[PDB]
From a paper:
DHFR catalyzes the reduction of 5,6-dihydrofolic acid (DHF) to 5,6,7,8-tetrahydrofolic acid (THF) by enantiospecific hydride transfer from NADPH cofactor. THF and its derivatives are essential precursors for the biosynthesis of DNA bases and amino acids.
To gain greater mechanistic insight, we next characterized the atomic structures of wild-type DHFR (DHFRWT) and mutant DHFR with an L28R replacement (DHFRL28R) using X-ray crystallography. Both DHFRWT (resolution 1.9 Å) and DHFRL28R (resolution 2.1 Å) were individually co-crystalized with the cofactor NADPH and inhibitor TMP. Consequently, we recognized that the 2,4-diamino pyrimidine group of the drug can equally bind to the active site of both DHFRWT and DHFRL28R, and should not be altered when designing an L28R-specific DHFR inhibitor.
Residue numbers in the entry: 1 to 159
Amino acid sequence: MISLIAALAVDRVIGMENAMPWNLPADLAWFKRNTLNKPVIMGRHTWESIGRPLPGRKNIILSSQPGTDDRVTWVKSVDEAIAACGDVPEIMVIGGGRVYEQFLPKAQKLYLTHIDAEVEGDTHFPDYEPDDWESVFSEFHDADAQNSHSYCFEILERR
Ligand SMILES: NC(=O)C1=CN([C@@H]2O[C@H](COP(=O)(O)OP(=O)(O)OC[C@H]3O[C@@H](n4cnc5c(N)ncnc54)[C@H](OP(=O)(O)O)[C@@H]3O)[C@@H](O)[C@H]2O)C=CC1
Ligand SMILES: COc1cc(Cc2cnc(N)nc2N)cc(OC)c1OC
Ligand SMILES: [Cl-]
């Protein structure tokens, strides 16, 4: 079972200049809760944005180039990434844009953070038909001292 987890601003913006154009410690907490002790598949741009391994998860990096960090697992293809996860209940695909594009069709589950922010972006979450998806869980949160935007945590299931 392949799952995507992503945080979407207004207009499906997920990124700008190899970072997320916001600062939502509550989102990173949600991300950590839902990824801990599961394999994570990320693209090389995302790996470099994060800048260090994600503790409690097998870190699988997609890159056509040879690896540059002995602590994580490097793969050269989707099929290799997926085999590198092994026999697990849930594969977590954690970004970015190009990687989401490739796994969304294989994905059974979406973990979305809807962020109330109209921010400039160079990377967007892939388009998809919502007819194909059923909302399972949502949870709304007001902005606070540490989170300048309101947000909603939603889980969706294919059909
Ligand atoms: N809002 C959110 O939830 C999140 C936001 N982001 C944002 O996403 C953006 C980055 O996304 P994007 O630019 O698409 O890049 P990605 O992070 O998806 O990484 C792309 C790179 O991954 C490698 N790669 C991807 N697919 C393959 C494949 N099939 N075979 C081999 N190598 C592959 C390549 O590395 P190489 O070039 O070395 O071959 C490619 O250049 C950033 O702005 C980041 O902040 C990311 C995570 C979460
Ligand atoms: C833990 O820190 C990061 C995590 C992520 C991935 C990510 C973050 N939030 C959500 N909701 N989904 C994701 N896939 C992406 C990041 O930057 C691109 C991070 O660095 C701040
Ligand atoms: Cl690519």
